[PDB]
Amino acid sequence: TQARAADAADDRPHRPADWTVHHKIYYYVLVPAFSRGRCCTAGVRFDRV
Amino acid sequence: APQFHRPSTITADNVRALGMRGLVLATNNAQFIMDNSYPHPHGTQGAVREFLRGQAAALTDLGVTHANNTFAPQPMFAGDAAAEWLRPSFGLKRTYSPFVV
Amino acid sequence: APQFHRPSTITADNVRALGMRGLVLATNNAQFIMDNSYPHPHGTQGAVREFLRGQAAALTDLGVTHANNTFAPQPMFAGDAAAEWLRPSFGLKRTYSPFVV
């Protein structure tokens, strides 16, 4: 996911500590504030994609 | 040529062989008097069934005269694909402009 | 030419030599009848895998035909530059128009 695929990463990340917290803000809260029940996930056939 | 004041005259070949431009002025220049001593064999309602078999085969002849204007229409709805195992079938929401300069 | 109605024909050399302009038409114009008398050695899931390295490595081919078109790939991010001891490594947001007349 990071900008530097040359300076790759398996153990040491690139993101701040609030980065996933920001996603936990954006996914768990804001999308239900626009959902009113109407949204759902998807599992991806990346071979088809 | 078909006569549109007689019930037992209108066939499928009389409408298809006549052009779509020629179908306009032929029907507009008929006679107001309807004749009733020799009728159409399938009745008065059956002659209207036979008249509509020529106009449906006339746009297919009109599509040939405009085949050098538009393209080949790719499918509109999914479920129509040869390869359904590595990709989906798309479906054209046909918002395009079929036109060949 | 790889036959798209038998999965025992798709290799990476046969698809990369094919352009992506022509792979649009070859998928929709095939035979709908899937055949099952010659299976695939990597499995039928491995035949989809062998198809997509054939498409991905062909993306260099569709790009090299457009090599007189776009610009040099600017370093998008920091850390990609040689001399670091007095000036930094820039990262160029590639929001421009890659086009050379």
Swiss-Prot record, chain A:
In which compartments does the protein localize? Virion; Host nucleus
State the oligomer form and interacting partners: Homomultimer. Makes the hexons and eleven out of twelve pentons. Interacts with triplex proteins 1/TRX1 and 2/TRX2; adjacent capsomers are linked together in groups of three by triplexes, heterotrimeric complexes composed of one molecule of TRX1 and two molecules of TRX2. Interacts with scaffold protein; this interaction allows efficient MCP transport to the host nucleus. Interacts with capsid vertex component 2/CVC2. Interacts with the small capsomere-interacting protein/SCP.
- Write out the function statement from the record: Self-assembles to form an icosahedral capsid with a T=16 symmetry, about 200 nm in diameter, and consisting of 150 hexons and 12 pentons (total of 162 capsomers). Hexons form the edges and faces of the capsid and are each composed of six MCP molecules. In contrast, one penton is found at each of the 12 vertices. Eleven of the pentons are MCP pentamers, while the last vertex is occupied by the portal complex.
Protein family according to the UniProt entry = Belongs to the herpesviridae major capsid protein family.
* Name of the protein in question: Major capsid protein
Q: Which organism is it from?
A: Human herpesvirus 2 (strain HG52) (HHV-2)
Q: According to the record, which residues of the full protein are present here?
A: 787 to 835 of 1374
